[model samples]
Target: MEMEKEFEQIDKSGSWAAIYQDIRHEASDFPSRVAKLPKNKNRNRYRDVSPFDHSRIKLHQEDNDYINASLIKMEEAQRSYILTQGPLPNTVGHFWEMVWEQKSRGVVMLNRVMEKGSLKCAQYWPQKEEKEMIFEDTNLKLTLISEDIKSYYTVRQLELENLTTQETREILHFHYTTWPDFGVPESPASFLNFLFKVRESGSLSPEHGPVVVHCSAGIGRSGTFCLADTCLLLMDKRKDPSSVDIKKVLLEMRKFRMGLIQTADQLRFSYLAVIEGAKFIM
Candidate 1:
C-alpha cells in the first residue's frame, strides 16, 4: 500500500513548541497541569511545578534531544531503491518509496499476505472464496505457518517463492512479550524455538542468504524484532551490555522504517523484550 503523509503545523509559539524552544523552562506549567496537585493546591493556582517532576525534567529533556539527534543520524543513513508495488487507501505511495530506499541500503522488505476469514465478524468472516485474490497479480506465494497465538500466511513466503536468491543464510524474527491479545511473555522464547527448529530442519540459513520476516504493518512487531537483533549483534561484537540504548536504537529504526511500532505501548514492549532477550546473552 502507498504510505500517506499526514502533516501538521509545528507551531513555534505553541506549548509544545515552547517546550522544545526552552526545554529547561518550567514555562506555562503545562506539566504541572497534568500532575496530581496537592489537596491544598487551588485549582487556579499555578506554580513552577511541572507535570514532569524536577528530578525527571533533566532526563526528559535529555531523552528528547537524544531522540531528535538519533533521528537526524538515521535520516542520514538513508539509501535508495525502487518500488515494485502500488498505493493503498488512506496512504500515499511515499511509504513504498521509503521502503524501496531502505532496500537499496541492504534493508530487507517483508511483505504481508491477506487471508480469507481472518477479518472479525464481517459478512466475509469466513471468506468462502477458494482462490487467493490478494497479491495474486504479484504471484507471491506466501509461507503458511502455525504458531500458538495465530496462524496465517507469512512474508517469508514471498521471499522463498520469488526472491530465493535474496535469502540470507541467517534470519531472525522478533516479537514482544505483550500484544493486545496474542502477546505472551513466552512469545520471544517461542519464536526462538521456532527458528531453531527451522534451522535444524534446514528450512532457513545464513548459507541460504537473506531471511525475511513480517507481521501486520511490518513495523511494530517486525521492527522491534529487528532492533533487538541488531542490539544483540552489537553486544556480541562489542561485548558491552550497557552500550545498547534501546530508545536510540528504535529512533534510528523509525527513520528507515516509518512507524517502527510508533505507539507508546508498543515502544514500551520493545524495551521490555530487548531487556528480556539480553538476559539470555549474559
Candidate 2:
C-alpha cells in the first residue's frame, strides 16, 4: 500500500523530475579522475559517461589497469553489478579480460550493437558461422556454443578460454533487444519478466563476482536494471515490501557509479518496474 501510494504521490505531483534533479545535485561533485587520464581517453565510448575512480574496476593484468567499468555493490542486499559502457572496438579485449579475471557468469546487454544510425557497441562476440574469435591483446578466445532467440531478446551461451593457461569457462549473454527510444522498456511486466530470467540464472547471487550490465553509455538503462532488481530484493527481505524506498536505494547506487538513471522518465520506470517485481517477491 505504501509503495503504490508513494508512486501515486510522485506521479500525480509530477515530482519524479525534482527527485531526479536532487539525486544528480547530490552526486554532482564526485571525482572520476582515472577516466580523465589522457592515456585512457580512447577506452571510453562517450566522453561524459565515465566511471568514478573509487569504484572503477581495474584490469588485474600487467597492462594499463584501466577499463571503463564500475563495480556497484549493494552490501546490504549482498548484490553487486558491473556497470560499463558498450565495449569500444579496441577495448573489446579489455572487456573480456575484465569478465575473465572477475569471474563473471553472465553479461547483460541492454542495447543493440547498432542503434539509430551509429555503432553503439562493437561486435564483441563471434558470428554463428565463425564459431570463435581470438583477442591477442587479452590472449583469450571466445566461442559461441548456442543461441536461444526470442522475439524481444536473445540468450547466448559462450565458451571463453585463456590462451596462456588453456582454462575455459562458459559465460551466459542476456541481450534485451526491444527497449524503446524513450529510455524505458515497453512495460514493467515485460521488463520484470526479463529481470526474473536473469535472477533465475543465479548470476546475481553473492557467489559470483558481479553480472556485467551495459547499454550504449552504461548509465540510463543499466542503472534502471540494477535499481529494480535491487529494490525487489530489498522487498523480499522486509516484513512489508513497501518499506523499501526506491529513491533512497538509487541514491546509494549512484555513489558507486555516476549518472545512474539519467532521465526523470527512467527514474519513474524504475518505480514501476520495482513495484511490478514486488508482486512476485511479496
Candidate 3:
C-alpha cells in the first residue's frame, strides 16, 4: 500500500508540474499578445500627455464637499478612489491633524508613501519624541488605526519630475517587473490581497472605504496603479477580454484628478502588467 501511494504521488507531481509550467508560459505571453493588437488612435495621444497641475491646488469648500460626497458614494458602491500627491508634510502635527479630521467623520485612510521611513514612523511613533506630539496633541478624537484593517505601505521614493530620465523609467520598469513575485499569484490576487488586508485589519469596511494611494503630485505613480487595477478588473469581467479599454477608464478618472497617470511608459507598463497577470489565472 505504501509503495502504491508513493507511485501515485510521483505520477501526480510529474503531470501537475508540467501543467503548471505550461500555464505559466502561456500566461507570460498574454501581455505580448495584447500588445500586438491594433493601436487605438486615441491611446497614444492620451498617453503622451501629463494630467496633473503642480500649482498648489488647495481643497476649497465646494471642492471638499464634492470630494466628501464622492468618497461617500465610492464607499457605498464598494469602489475606491486613489489620490495622488507629491508628499505629506514632514511635520507630524500637520499630518496627524489632517488624518484626524478625515477619520473623525468615519473615513478610514490608507496612506501609501514612497519614502522609506514614512511607514515605520507612522506605524510606531510613540518611541520617538519628535513624532509623539503629532499623536498626543490631537484632540480631534482620531484613532490611531490598526494594521489589521486599512493598512499602509511605503515604497522606496520614486521621483516623477523627470519622466524622461533613465531613473524614472527604471523605477517604472522595476515596479512592473518585480511586483508579481511578491507571493501574490497574480495581479488580481495582489490587488485583492491589498483590499483584504485592509478589511481584515478593520481599517476599511468590506462594503465600503476608499483605498487611497498617493505620490507627490498624484499623477504618474498613482495613475499607473489605478490604470492597472481598472484594466485588470474589466478584463476579468469581459467575456472576450482584450486590452480592457484603458483609455476610456483614464479619461473618466481624469475628470476628478488631473495627471492621474502621466507617461507613455506608465501606461505601457500597466498594459503589460495586466497581460502578465492573465497568464497566472490558468
Candidate 4:
C-alpha cells in the first residue's frame, strides 16, 4: 500500500470538558432529564451516563429507551461511529435496539464482559452458534452465526432480524479484549492492527450507517478508538495530513458524545496510535 509513504509525517495528538462540557450542563433541563429515570425503565442503570441531547441518537420507533449512545459523524473523514456505553443487564436489548434502528453493519466493542471481576456488560449477543435472543421491546431477534476467537480479540458473525419487517442483516462484531485500565492498549501496534482488521472488513465504510463503538462509558476508550480511526482516514483522504488535528477532531466528536478522551493518558495514547497508523494509511 503506497499509503505508508503518505502518512509518514502525520502524528496523533485531547481533554474532558475542555470545550462543550460546561455548555451541556448549562442547558436549563440538564438536571431534570438526568433525573428523569422513571420515564424510561433502564435509565437509572446508566447512572452517570448520558448523551448530549442536541446530537443524541434517539430511537423514534422504540418505546422511549434513550440509551447513552450518540452517532458521531465525521463527514470530512467519511466516518460516522455510534459511540455508546457498555450495556447494563436491563439495557442489553436497548443496546441492540439502537444498533437495529441505526442499521449499523459492525459493532466495535472495546471492553470485556467483566471489568475487575464485576459484570461490565451483559452477554448481549448469543454466546453459541445459532443461539438466539429476542428483544420483545424492539421485536428484534439476534442469533449467533459463528465466532472467530483470537488471542487478543474475537470476531463474531451475528444475524439480526427485525420481526416487524421480516428483514434480516448480518452484523460484524469486533471485540478488542485487552486494554489497560484507566488508559489504552499496551502497544499502539496491536491496537492499530486490530483497527485495520475492522477497516478491511468494509465495516468502517460510510455506505453503511455508523460503525457502533462502545466501552464501559463510551468515552475514554471509545473516544480513543474513534479518534485514531477518524484521524487516519483524514490523513489518507486530505491533501495534507497536518490538517487533521487530533484535539479538534475530538472536540467535534464530543459534540455527539460527552466526555470524549477521558484522561490525559488516553489522549497521549491516541497520539501514539495515530502516528503509527499513519504508517499504513499511505
What TM-score would you give candidate 4 relative to the actual structure?
Answer: 0.84
| lDDT of residue 54 for candidate 1 | 24
Highest lDDT against the true fold, candidate: 2
lDDT per residue (tens digit) for residues 1-282 in model 4 = 232323332221123324334434432332326225677656534566677666677776535647777778787887788888888777777788888888889999998888887777778889977558999876889999989999878999999988989999999999998886555666798788899899899898868878899987788888888999888888888787776777677777766666787765676678779877787666
- Best candidate per TM-score, number? 2
1 or 4, greater by TM-score: 4
Candidate 3 wrongly placed segments (more than 4 Å): 1-78, 86-206
Better of 2 and 4 by lDDT: 2
Q: What TM-score does structure 3 among the candidates reach?
A: 0.44
What TM-score against the true fold does each predicted structure earn?
0.40, 0.96, 0.44, 0.84
What candidate 4 gets wrong by more than 4 Å, as runs, is: 1-37, 44-46
**Total backbone collisions, model 1:** 19
- Candidate 1: stretches off by over 4 Å: 1-188, 191-210
Better by lDDT, candidate 2 or 1:
2
For model 2, residues 1-282, the per-residue Cα lDDT tens digits are: 477788899878978879888888877457999899999989998889888888999998775999999999998888989999999989999999999999999999998887777799999998783768999998999999989999878889999999999999999999998898555665787778888899899788878879999999999999999998888778878786667888788889988888998899998888888767776764
- Across 138-235, the per-residue lDDT of candidate 1 in tens digits comes to 22222322222333212121111223233322222222223334343334564443333333533233333222333444444555555655655555
lDDT of each: 0.32, 0.87, 0.36, 0.76
Total backbone clashes of candidate 4, pairs 3 or more residues apart or in separate chains:
3
Candidate 2 overall Cα lDDT vs. reference?
A: 0.87
Which segments of candidate 2 are over 4 A away from where they belong? none
